[PDB]
Amino acid sequence: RFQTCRLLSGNVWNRELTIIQRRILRRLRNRKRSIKKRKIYPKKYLTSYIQLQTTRKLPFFYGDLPITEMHRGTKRTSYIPFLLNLETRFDVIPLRLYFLETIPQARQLISHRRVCVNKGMVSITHFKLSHGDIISFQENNAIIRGEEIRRSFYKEILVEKIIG
C-alpha cells in the first residue's frame, strides 16, 4: 500500500501512481527523504533507524511474512534464512523472479490452482526446492499465462520502458 511508502519515506512499489500520488511522492521523497537522509548526524540511533527501515522494506518485498520472526526462529542474526527462503519459498520467490507479482496474485495460486513440480502438485505455498526440480504450470494455466507472460515481457519491459 502507498501509505507504507509514505511511512518508509520513499517508494514501496505501489502500482499505477495516480496524479496526486505523483505530487505527494515528489514532495515526500525529495523534501523528507533528503532532509532526514541528507545531512543530520542524529544520535537518534541512526543504526536502529536504518534497521527499522530495512526490516520494514523487506516484508512487502516478500508479501507479508514477519522477517524479524524469521531472524528469531534461528539464533543467528541473518543471511542464512535469507539465502534459504530465497533458495525457495516456491511461490513468492520463484514465481515472481520469473513471471508474476509475488503478492497474493502469485500466492493463492498454489492454494487453488496448480503448478505441478516434476508433474507433481506441491500446494503448500512455502516449499523449499533445490538441485533438480522441474517447475511446470498446468495446461489450463498455460492457455492464459503464456499470453500473460508475453504481455508482461513486452507491455511491461518494452512498452513501459520505451515510453520511459
Partner: protein, 142 residues
C-alpha cells in the same frame, strides 16, 4: 555453462520439440525472440565458488625458525575445495535429476498395490540387499 544447466537445456528443448510435434508447427518462441541486450542482466557462472570461501575463521599455526619448507597459496588452496564441492555437486544433481526423470512416469498419490517388501538391512555390514516380489518368494536380486 554449468553442467546440470546444460542437462536441463537438453531435456527442455527435447520435450519442447516433442510438443512441437504435438501442437503442430505453431511454435511460440515469442519472448525467446528477444535478443536486445538492454533489458537483462542474466549473470551466468562459468567457474563456481568465487564470491567468498566457506569461512574465514581467524586461526593460525606457527612453524619454527628452520621451517625448511615452502608455503602454499590461498587462491591456490581455494578452488581445490571448490573442486571438491563441484564434484559432489555434479554427483548429487545427477542423482536427483535422474530420479526426477525416472519419476516423470510414476505414482505419488492415493493408489498403490503394495505386495513386495524389499528385503534389506544388516545394520553392521549392509551392502547387500534383495526384494521379495508379490506372493512369490523371489529374493537374491537387486
Amino acid at each position: 555453462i554449468m553442467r546440470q544447466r546444460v542437462h536441463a537445456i537438453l531435456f527442455l528443448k527435447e520435450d519442447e520439440e516433442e510438443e512441437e510435434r504435438k501442437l503442430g508447427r505453431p511454435l511460440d518462441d515469442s519472448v525467446d525472440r528477444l535478443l536486445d541486450e538492454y533489458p537483462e542482466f542474466f549473470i551466468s557462472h562459468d567457474r563456481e565458488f568465487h564470491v567468498a570461501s566457506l569461512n574465514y575463521k581467524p586461526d593460525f599455526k606457527v612453524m619454527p625458525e628452520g621451517w625448511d619448507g615452502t608455503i602454499k597459496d590461498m587462491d591456490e588452496v581455494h578452488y581445490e575445495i571448490s573442486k571438491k564441492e563441484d564434484d559432489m555437486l555434479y554427483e548429487e544433481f545427477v542423482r536427483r535429476f535422474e530420479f526426477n526423470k525416472m519419476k516423470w512416469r510414476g505414482e505419488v498419490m492415493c493408489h498403490k498395490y503394495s505386495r513386495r517388501r524389499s528385503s534389506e538391512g544388516w545394520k553392521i555390514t549392509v551392502e547387500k540387499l534383495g526384494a521379495k516380489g508379490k506372493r512369490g518368494a523371489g529374493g537374491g536380486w537387486k
